[PDB]
Structure 1
Amino acid sequence: FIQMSVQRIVEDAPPIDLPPRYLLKFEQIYLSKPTHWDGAPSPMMPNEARLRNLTYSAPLYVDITKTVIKEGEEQLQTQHQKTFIGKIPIMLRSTYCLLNGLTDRDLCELNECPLDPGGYFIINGSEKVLIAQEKMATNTVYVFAKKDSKYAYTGECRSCLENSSRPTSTIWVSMLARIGQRIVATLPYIKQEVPIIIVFRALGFVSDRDILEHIIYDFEDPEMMEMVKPSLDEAFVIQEQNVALNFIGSRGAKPGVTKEKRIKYAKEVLQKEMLPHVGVSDFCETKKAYFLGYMVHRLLLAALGRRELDDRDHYGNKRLDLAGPLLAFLFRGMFKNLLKEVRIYAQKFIDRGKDFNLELAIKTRIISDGLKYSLATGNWGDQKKAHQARAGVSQVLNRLTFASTLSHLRRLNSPIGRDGKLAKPRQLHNTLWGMVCPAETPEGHAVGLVKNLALMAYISVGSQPSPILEFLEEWSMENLEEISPAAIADATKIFVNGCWVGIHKDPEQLMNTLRKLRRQMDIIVSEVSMIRDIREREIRIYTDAGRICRPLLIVEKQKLLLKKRHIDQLKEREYNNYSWQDLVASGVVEYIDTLEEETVMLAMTPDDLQEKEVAYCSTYTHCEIHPSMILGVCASIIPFPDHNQSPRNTYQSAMGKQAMGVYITNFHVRMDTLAHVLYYPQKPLVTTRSMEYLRFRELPAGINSIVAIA
C-alpha cells in the first residue's frame, strides 16, 4: 500500500483546472520516517508514542507543479517540492517503521520485545488492529437462482476497474420464469431495467445475426436460440441505434425531456458506467458487446441446466481485504475531499483576480485527522455518514496472552449482518481446508462469521497483469477483436482477472507453459493462479489481491520433486544461504489458491498414498506438507486434538485467549490497562510440533499440575 497504492492514487486523480486559470498537478510523493516536534523534528520510538498517547504517524510530502496560463502566453511552471499533506500512521515493524531489521539487542535497548510480531498501528497511544474483511469477488459472472422473486435465474456481475473513485457497478441479467423467458438487464445508475436486445442495439449492432453470434457460438442445437427467441421478439419495434438510445435514456436518473438529452445520457451511462473493468475508454464496444454476450450465454447455459449454479460460500469466489485495500479505500475519498477543498478555495480567491498561495490552500487537517479518526473508532468511512458503512473494522489489540495477540492479528470477518435468520454463511464450507482453522470461532452471536487464518495460509498482495498479457499475446493467443465468431465454438476462452480477452486453440501446451513459467518465477509470479475448465473450454488467470492460498509439494508422476538434496541443503541453513524462497525458486513447492485447488489431486502423505497398492488414483499432482497445518494458532496448541469432540476443540480455541500468562516480555514498561501475569508459567510437558513456531515455549500460559480424576 505505502509503496505503490498512494502514488497510484495521487497520479490517477484527474488534473484540477478551472480570468485565467492554473494547472496544479501532483506527482512524486515523498514519505519520511515518523518524527515528533516550539520544537524541531526528531524521531519517536513506538514505546514513547505508546506511553505519551501520541500517534505513530509520518508526514507525507508531494511534488506540485503550478502553471498559470493567460492571454499572451505568460505561463510559469513553478514547482513546489515536498509540500506537506498530512500524517499517515505506520504499521509497526513495516518497511517505514523505525523498528525495521534491527537486531534483538537494539529492540531490548529500546524497551521493545523482540517477540512482538508487530502488524498493528498506534493511534492516541492505543494499539489498533485491522480485521481482514471478506467480500464477493469482483469482475466475475455469478449465476444464482432465487425462488423469492420473479427471476428464474440471474447472472450478477460486480465490477470495478482499478481502485477508482466511482463505486463498483453491478450488472444483472435476469430471466423471467412465467412465450416466456423474458431476458432483461438491470443497468446500474438507471432506475428501471431494460431488455438485453435493446442494449445490444444501443451498442450499435443492428444486425440480428451479429447479436446472436455474440450470444450463441453454436448453430446446430437450437435450445439457446429457442429460449432467446421470445426475448428477440419483445424488442421488435427497435431497430436503429438512436431510438434504442432514446428508449434507454427515457429511464435514466435525469430523464431529459428532449430526445437529444436522452441520447446523450444513455450514451454516457453506457460508455462510462456499464462494465468499467473491460474498459471505459473512447470506445470499447467491440469487447463490451462480447462480454455482455458471454454473460447472456452463461445465463442461458444455467437455464438449460448444462452448467450448475455458482456457490456464494465457495471461497474461490471470495476476496479478503487487508489493511492495504482498506487504507486505499479511505485515501481515495480523503484525497478527493482535499482536492475539493483546494478547488473551492481557488474559486473563492480567483474571483477577485488575486493570486493565491497554495501553501495556505492545502489543509493538513483533512488527511491526518480523518484517517486517525477512522482508524481509531473503527467506523470505516466518512465521519459525517459513518453509520452508512461498516463498523468494527479497527479493533483494540488484545494483549492478554501471547496466543490471544497472535490470534487477533490473523482474523477474518464476514460482513454478513448479525441477528440474521440465515445459517448458510455460518456453516463450515468444504473449501475452507488449509485456508481457515476449522475449530477457532466465537461462540456468541457471531458464530461462524469470524474466522482465523490457518498456519501456512497466505494472502495474495496482487500484481500487475500486463506482463502476462504480453507473454500470452506473443504466443498463439488471438485477440478478441480479430477472430471470426465461428471459431469461438471450437476453441477455449481466455479470461484475465475476469476480463474476457482473446482465444486459443491448444490449451494443454498453454497450461504447461504457464505452469513452467510460474515454477521458474521468471514472468509469472508465484501469486498468479491459473485454472482450466474441461467441460467448458475456459481458462481463467487471476492476479488480483485478496486471494487466499497455501503452499503445496509438487508431484510429477508418483514421486515428489523434493529429495534428500533439498532436505540436506535446508538442514544446514543459516550457515549457507539456502532458505524457503530458494526452495520455491527450485520449483519444488507451489502456492495453490482455493480456486485452483478445485482442479488438482492431493495426496495426504507421500509414503502412504503414493506407493503401489490397489489402484485408487495413481495420478496425484500435489502432496500436503503436513496435515496438521489446517489448524489455526489457538487450535494448534491442543495435544491430540483428533481424539476430542469438535465442540470441545472450539471451546479450547476460545478459552486459550483468556489464559493467564506472560503476554509479553517487557510488561514492566507498558502502562496497559487490565494486565494479568502469572508468577510461574511452565512449558507444557506434552506439546505439539506446531506450537514450536508460536513461541509458546518462550511465553507459556499455564502450569503442569498433578491432576487426579476422582
Structure 2
Amino acid sequence: FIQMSVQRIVEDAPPIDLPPRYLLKFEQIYLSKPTHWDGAPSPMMPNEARLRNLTYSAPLYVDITKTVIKEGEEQLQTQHQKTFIGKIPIMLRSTYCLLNGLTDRDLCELNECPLDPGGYFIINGSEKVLIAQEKMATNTVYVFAKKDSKYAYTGECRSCLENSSRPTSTIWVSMLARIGQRIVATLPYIKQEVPIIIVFRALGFVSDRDILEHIIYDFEDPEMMEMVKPSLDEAFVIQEQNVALNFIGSRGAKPGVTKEKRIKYAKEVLQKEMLPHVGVSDFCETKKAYFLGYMVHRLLLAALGRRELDDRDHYGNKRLDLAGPLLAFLFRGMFKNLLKEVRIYAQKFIDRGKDFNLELAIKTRIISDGLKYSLATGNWGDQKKAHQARAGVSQVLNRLTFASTLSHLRRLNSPIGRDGKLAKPRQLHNTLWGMVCPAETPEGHAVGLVKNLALMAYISVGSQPSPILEFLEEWSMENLEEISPAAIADATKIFVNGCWVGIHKDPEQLMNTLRKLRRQMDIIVSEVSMIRDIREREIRIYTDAGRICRPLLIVEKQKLLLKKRHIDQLKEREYNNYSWQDLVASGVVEYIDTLEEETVMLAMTPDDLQEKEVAYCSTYTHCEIHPSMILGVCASIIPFPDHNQSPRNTYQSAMGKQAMGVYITNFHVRMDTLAHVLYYPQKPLVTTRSMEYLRFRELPAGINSIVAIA
C-alpha cells in the first residue's frame, strides 16, 4: 500500500482547472520515517509513542506543479518541492518503521523485545489491528438461483477496473421464470430492467446473426439455440441504434426531456457505468458485446443443466482485504476531499481577481485526522456518513497471552450480519482445508463467521497483469477483437482476472509453458494461479490481491522434486545463504490457491501414498508437506488433538487465549491496562512440533501439575 497504492492514487487523480485558469498537477511523492517535534525533527520511538499517548505516524510529502494561465499568453508553470500533505500512521516492523532491520540487541536496548510480531498500528498510544474482511470476488460471472422471485436464474457479475473512485457497480443478466423464459438485464443506474436484445442493439448490432454469433458459439444444438427465441420475439420492434438508446433512456435515473438527451445519457451510462473492467477506452463494444454474450451463454448453460450453479461458500470465489486495500479505500476519499478543498480555496480567490497561495489551500488536518479517526474507532468510512460503512474493522490488540496476540493478528471476518438464521455461511466448507483452522472459532452469536488462518496460509498481495498479457500476445494466442466467431467453438477461451482476452487453439502446451515459467519464477511471479477447465474449454489466470494460497510439494511422475541435497543445504542455512526462497526458486514447492487446488491431485504423505500398490490414482501432482499444518495458531498447541471430540478442540482454542502467562518479555516497561502475568510459567512436558515456531517455549502459559483422576 505504501510503495505502490499511494503513488497510484495521487497520480491518477484528475487535475483541477478553473478568464484565468490553472492546472495544479501532482507528481512523485516522498515519505520519511516517523518523527515528532517548536522542536527539531527527531525520530520517534514506538515505545515513546506508546507511553506518551502519541500516534506512530509518518509525514507525507508530494511534488506539485502549479500552472496558471490567463488571457494574453500568461502561463506560469511554477512547482513546489515536498509540500506537506498529512501524516500516515505506520505499522510496526514495516519497511518504513524505525524497528526495521535492527538486530535483537538493538531492539533490547530500545526496550522492544525481539519477539513482538509487529503488524499493528499505534493510535493515541493504543495498539490497533486491522481485521481482514472477506468479500465475494469481483470481475467474475457467477450464476445462482433465487427460487423466491420472478427469476429462475441470475448471472450476477461485479465489475471494478482498477481502484475506481466510485465503488463496484453490479450487472445482472437473469431469466424470467413463468412462451415465457425471457432473458433480461438489470443495468446500473437504471430504475427498470430491460430485455437483452434491446441492449445488444443499443451497442449498434442492428444485424441479427451478429448477436447470435456473439451468444451462441455453435449452431448445431437445437435446444440451446431455441431458448433465445422467447427473448428474441419479444424484441423485434426495436432495430436501429437510436431507438434502442431512447428506449433505455426512458427508464434512466434522471431521464432526459429530449430524444438527444435520452440518447446521450444512455450512451454515456453504457460507455462509463456498464462493465468498467473490460475497458473504458474510446470504444469497447467489440469486447463488451462478447462479455455480454458470455454472460448470456453461461446463463443458458446453467438453464440447460450442462453446467452446475456456482457456490457462494466456496472460497475460490472470495477475496480477503488486508490493511492495504482498506487503507487505499480510505485514502481515495481522503484525497478527493483535499482536492475539493484546494479547488474551493483557489476558486474563492480567482473569481475576485486575487492570487492564491497553495500553502494555505492544503488542509493537512482533514487527511491526517480522517485516517487517525478511522483507525481508532473502526467505523471504516467518513465520519458524517458512516451509517453506510462497516464497523469493528479495527480493534484493540488483545495483549493478554502471546497465543491470543498471534491469533488476533491472523483473524478473518465474514461481514454477513449476525442474528441471521442462515447456516450455510456458518458451516465448515470443504474448501477450508489448509487455509483456515477447522477448530478455532468463537462459540457465541458469531460462531462460524470469525475465522483464523492456518499456519502455512499466505494471502496474495497482487501484481500488474501486463507481463502476462505481453507473453500471451507474443505466444500463439489470437486477440479477441480480430477473431472469427466461427472459430470459438473448437478452441479454448482465455481469461485474465475475469477479463476475457483472446482465444487459444492449443491449451495443453500453453498450460505447460505457464507452469514451467512460474516454477522458474522469471516472468510470472509465484502469486499467479493458472486454472484450466476441461469440461468447458476455458483457461483462467488470476493476479489480483486477496487470494489465499498455501505452499505444497511437487510430484513429477511418482517421486518428489525434493531430494537429499536440498535438505542438506537447508540444514546448513546459517552458514549457507540457502533459504526457503532458494527452495521456491528451484521449482520444488509451489504456492497453490483454492481454485488451482480444485484440479490438483494431492498426496497426504510421500513415503506412504506414492509407493506401488493396486493403482488408486497413480497420477499425483503435489504432496502435502505435513498434514498437521492445517491447524491455526491456537489449535496447534493442543496435544494429541486427533484423539479428542471435535467441540473440545474448539473450546480449548477459545480458552487458550485466556490463560495467563508472560504475555511479552518487556512487560515491566509497558504501562498496559489489565496486565496478567504468572510467577512460574513452564513449558509443556509433552509438546507438539508446531509450537516451536510459535515461541511457546519462551513465553509459556501454564504449569505442569501432578493430576489424579479420582
- Aligned-partner Cα distance in 2 for 1:330–1:492: 40
What is the Cα deviation at residue 166 of structure 1?
1.5
What is the Cα deviation at residue 19 of structure 1?
2.0
SS at match of 1:75: strand
SS at match of 1:65: strand
- Aligned-partner Cα distance in 2 for 1:343–1:148: 50
Checking the alignment, whether the CA contact within 8 Å between 2:397 and 2:405 is kept in structure 1 is: yes
What is the Cα deviation at residue 477 of structure 1?
0.1
Deviations 1:129-150 (A, max 9, x none): 0000000000000000111111
SS at match of 1:482: coil
SS at match of 2:78: strand
Identify the range of structure 1 (34-43 vs 137-146) with the bigger mean alpha-carbon deviation.
34-43
Checking the alignment, whether the CA contact within 8 Å between 1:139 and 1:158 is kept in structure 2 is: yes
- Aligned-partner Cα distance in 2 for 1:478–1:388: 44
What is the Cα deviation at residue 2 of structure 1?
0.2
Checking the alignment, whether the CA contact within 8 Å between 1:215 and 1:293 is kept in structure 2 is: yes
What is the Cα deviation at residue 349 of structure 1?
1.4
- Aligned-partner Cα distance in 1 for 2:269–2:43: 50
Checking the alignment, whether the CA contact within 8 Å between 1:61 and 1:84 is kept in structure 2 is: yes
What is the Cα deviation at residue 70 of structure 1?
1.4
Aligned sequence identity (%): 100
- Aligned-partner Cα distance in 1 for 2:667–2:599: 49
Q: How does 1:87-486 map to 2 (within 5 A)?
A: 87-486=87-486
- Aligned-partner Cα distance in 2 for 1:32–1:609: 54
Deviations 1:449-508 (A, max 9, x none): 000000000000000000000001111100001111000000000000000000000000
Residue 517 of structure 2 is aligned to residue 517 of structure 1? yes
Query: Segments of 4+ in structure 1 off by > 6 A?
Result: none
- Aligned-partner Cα distance in 2 for 1:610–1:242: 66
- Aligned-partner Cα distance in 1 for 2:18–2:440: 56
Deviations 1:384-421 (A, max 9, x none): 01121110000000000000000000000000000011
What is the Cα deviation at residue 367 of structure 1?
0.5
SS at match of 1:268: helix
Checking the alignment, whether the CA contact within 8 Å between 1:88 and 1:371 is kept in structure 2 is: yes
SS at match of 1:164: coil
Q: How does 1:629-648 map to 2 (within 5 A)?
A: 629-648=629-648
So what's the TM-score if we normalise by structure 1?
Answer: 1.00
Deviations 1:640-666 (A, max 9, x none): 000001100000000010000000000
Checking the alignment, whether the CA contact within 8 Å between 1:107 and 1:114 is kept in structure 2 is: yes
Number of residue pairs matched by the alignment: 710
Deviations 1:419-462 (A, max 9, x none): 01111000000000000000000011000000000000000000
- Aligned-partner Cα distance in 1 for 2:288–2:609: 48
Checking the alignment, whether the CA contact within 8 Å between 1:493 and 1:502 is kept in structure 2 is: yes
What is the Cα deviation at residue 94 of structure 1?
0.2
Checking the alignment, whether the CA contact within 8 Å between 2:19 and 2:71 is kept in structure 1 is: no
Deviations 1:267-287 (A, max 9, x none): 000000000000111111100
- Aligned-partner Cα distance in 1 for 2:520–2:556: 15
- Aligned-partner Cα distance in 1 for 2:503–2:641: 49
- Aligned-partner Cα distance in 1 for 2:86–2:235: 55
What is the Cα deviation at residue 626 of structure 1?
0.3
- Aligned-partner Cα distance in 1 for 2:388–2:185: 27
- Aligned-partner Cα distance in 2 for 1:698–1:129: 24
What is the Cα deviation at residue 344 of structure 1?
1.2
What is the Cα deviation at residue 72 of structure 1?
2.2
- Aligned-partner Cα distance in 1 for 2:73–2:506: 59
Q: Which runs of 5+ in 1 are unaligned?
A: none
What is the Cα deviation at residue 167 of structure 1?
1.4
- Aligned-partner Cα distance in 2 for 1:54–1:349: 37
What is the Cα deviation at residue 579 of structure 1?
0.3
SS at match of 2:228: helix
What is the Cα deviation at residue 71 of structure 1?
1.9
- Aligned-partner Cα distance in 2 for 1:101–1:463: 25
Deviations 1:334-380 (A, max 9, x none): 10011111111111111101110010000001100000000000000
- Aligned-partner Cα distance in 2 for 1:223–1:217: 14
What is the Cα deviation at residue 236 of structure 1?
1.1
So what's the TM-score if we normalise by structure 2?
Answer: 1.00
- RMSD of aligned residue pairs (Cα, Å): 0.5
SS at match of 2:471: helix
What is the Cα deviation at residue 164 of structure 1?
0.9
- Aligned-partner Cα distance in 1 for 2:19–2:672: 59
- Aligned-partner Cα distance in 2 for 1:121–1:95: 14
Identify the range of structure 1 (74-83 vs 543-552) with the bigger mean alpha-carbon deviation.
74-83
SS at match of 2:135: strand
- Aligned-partner Cα distance in 2 for 1:172–1:614: 50
Checking the alignment, whether the CA contact within 8 Å between 2:133 and 2:414 is kept in structure 1 is: yes
SS at match of 2:598: helix
Checking the alignment, whether the CA contact within 8 Å between 1:457 and 1:550 is kept in structure 2 is: yes
Checking the alignment, whether the CA contact within 8 Å between 2:157 and 2:171 is kept in structure 1 is: yes
Q: Which runs of 5+ in 2 are unaligned?
A: none
SS at match of 1:413: coil
SS at match of 2:575: coil
Corresponding residue number in structure 1 for 2:654: 654
- Aligned-partner Cα distance in 1 for 2:208–2:596: 38
- Aligned-partner Cα distance in 1 for 2:465–2:341: 35
Checking the alignment, whether the CA contact within 8 Å between 1:200 and 1:289 is kept in structure 2 is: yes
What is the Cα deviation at residue 38 of structure 1?
2.0
What is the Cα deviation at residue 16 of structure 1?
1.0
SS at match of 1:450: coil
- Aligned-partner Cα distance in 2 for 1:484–1:435: 42
Checking the alignment, whether the CA contact within 8 Å between 1:460 and 1:546 is kept in structure 2 is: yes
- Aligned-partner Cα distance in 2 for 1:579–1:40: 43
SS at match of 2:297: helix
Deviations 1:30-76 (A, max 9, x none): 10000000212111100000000000000000000001111222212
SS at match of 1:430: coil
- Aligned-partner Cα distance in 1 for 2:15–2:222: 53
Deviations 1:1-29 (A, max 9, x none): 00000000001111111220111001111
Checking the alignment, whether the CA contact within 8 Å between 1:322 and 1:546 is kept in structure 2 is: yes
- Aligned-partner Cα distance in 2 for 1:517–1:494: 17
What is the Cα deviation at residue 180 of structure 1?
1.1
What is the Cα deviation at residue 224 of structure 1?
2.0
- Aligned-partner Cα distance in 1 for 2:323–2:272: 29
- Aligned-partner Cα distance in 2 for 1:181–1:704: 70
- Aligned-partner Cα distance in 2 for 1:592–1:606: 18
Deviations 1:87-109 (A, max 9, x none): 00000000000000100110001
Checking the alignment, whether the CA contact within 8 Å between 1:15 and 1:24 is kept in structure 2 is: yes
SS at match of 1:531: strand
- Aligned-partner Cα distance in 2 for 1:506–1:236: 40
Checking the alignment, whether the CA contact within 8 Å between 2:156 and 2:170 is kept in structure 1 is: yes
- Aligned-partner Cα distance in 2 for 1:293–1:509: 27
Identify the range of structure 1 (132-141 vs 161-170) with the bigger mean alpha-carbon deviation.
161-170
- Aligned-partner Cα distance in 1 for 2:198–2:690: 60
- Aligned-partner Cα distance in 2 for 1:199–1:337: 36
Checking the alignment, whether the CA contact within 8 Å between 1:19 and 1:353 is kept in structure 2 is: no
- Aligned-partner Cα distance in 2 for 1:90–1:411: 20
SS at match of 1:60: strand
Deviations 1:569-612 (A, max 9, x none): 11111111000000000000000001100000000000110000
- Aligned-partner Cα distance in 2 for 1:614–1:490: 37
